[PDB]
Amino acid sequence: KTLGEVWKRELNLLDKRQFELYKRTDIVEVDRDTARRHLAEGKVDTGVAVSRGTAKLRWFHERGYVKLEGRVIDLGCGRGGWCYYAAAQKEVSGVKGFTLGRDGHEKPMNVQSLGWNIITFKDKTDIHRLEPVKCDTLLCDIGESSSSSVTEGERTVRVLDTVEKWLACGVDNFCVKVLAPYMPDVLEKLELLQRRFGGTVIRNPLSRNSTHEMYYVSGARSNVTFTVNQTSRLLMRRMRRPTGKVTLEADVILPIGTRSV
Ligand SMILES: Nc1ncnc2c1ncn2[C@@H]1O[C@H](CSCC[C@H](N)C(=O)O)[C@@H](O)[C@H]1O
């Protein structure tokens, strides 16, 4: 019954064309042309990002929504866009990335952007059953979209449930994907986590309109209900006023090489 659930219901009423127009209405995307060509050519020393994730984390990072410091852990790293971004930051001392990388799940990608050498990738790992490790910055970008709001809610509560075990070890910084912040139970878990660890949820402008995903971050504190609804209002507005107008932005190019001495 929340505004976001109404949004989800109306999203499912869109035919294929409607959905297509909607998905790219007033959105911002990075141009992946060059990165895709370089990766396809096997170039590992041009500093291109392995995925759209690098730009998403940079957005949070550059405006203080999440500080990237010391020991970084990246749950559900996939190709590794967040790991490579974090590894290139001077304040970061190490990066441990974990992901399934099996049964259709993408495996970490090997490139040599700055600090690749301080990253330890580990695949064939289900982070829901991985024993928490002490760290300073906790990152988690997991949440598989579903036509079912019930399912998005279940997957979202499971992620927050798992992440709470890691935050309970004591972490200074965090950035965690929240697939369905519009679901009632998720909203309440977020409110409880906020009273326990602080932070709030922020909508990344690089996220597509087809998902209501927002990120639980340590760099800001605000009323969760209000801001989740603001995003709901924006998404509903774009569905009612489709245009498919997209704004392209330069993708992230990181420096290259190992961090040594
Ligand atoms: N239970 C689990 N354990 C480990 N990894 C998981 C998982 N569930 C989902 N994942 C992985 O979480 C990843 C989310 S996509 C992450 C993109 C990454 N931030 C980047 O910048 O490239 C997917 O690769 C998915 O396979």
Kindly describe this structure.
- β2, α5 and β3 form a beta-alpha-beta unit.
- The chain has one domain: Rossmann fold, CATH 3.40.50.
- The chain is built from eight helices and nine strands.
- The protein has a seven-stranded mixed beta sheet with strand order 4-3-2-5-6-8-7, with helices on both faces. Strands 1-9 form a two-stranded parallel sheet.
- It is an alpha/beta fold and about 260 residues long.
- It starts with a helix and ends in a 12-residue tail after the last strand.
- The site of S-adenosyl-L-homocysteine (SAH) has 21 residues, from α4 and α5.
- It is a peripheral membrane protein.
- It is found in: Host endoplasmic reticulum membrane; Host nucleus.
- This is RNA-directed RNA polymerase NS5.
- Homodimer. Interacts with host STAT2; this interaction prevents the establishment of cellular antiviral state. Interacts with serine protease NS3. Interacts with host TRIM23; this interaction leads to NS5 ubiquitination.
- Judged by helices, strands and strand pairing, the structural class is alpha/beta
Number of strands: 9
Mind telling me which CATH architecture this is?
3-Layer(aba) Sandwich
CATH superfamily: Vaccinia Virus protein VP39
CATH fold-type name: Rossmann fold
PDB class: transferase
Keywords: yellow fever virus, NS5 methyltransferase, RNA cap binding, ATP-binding, Capsid protein, Cleavage on pair of basic residues, Endoplasmic reticulum, Envelope protein, Glycoprotein, Helicase, Hydrolase, Membrane, Metal-binding, Multifunctional enzyme
Assembly: monomeric
Entry title: Crystal structure of yellow fever virus methyltransferase complexed with S-adenosyl-L-homocysteine
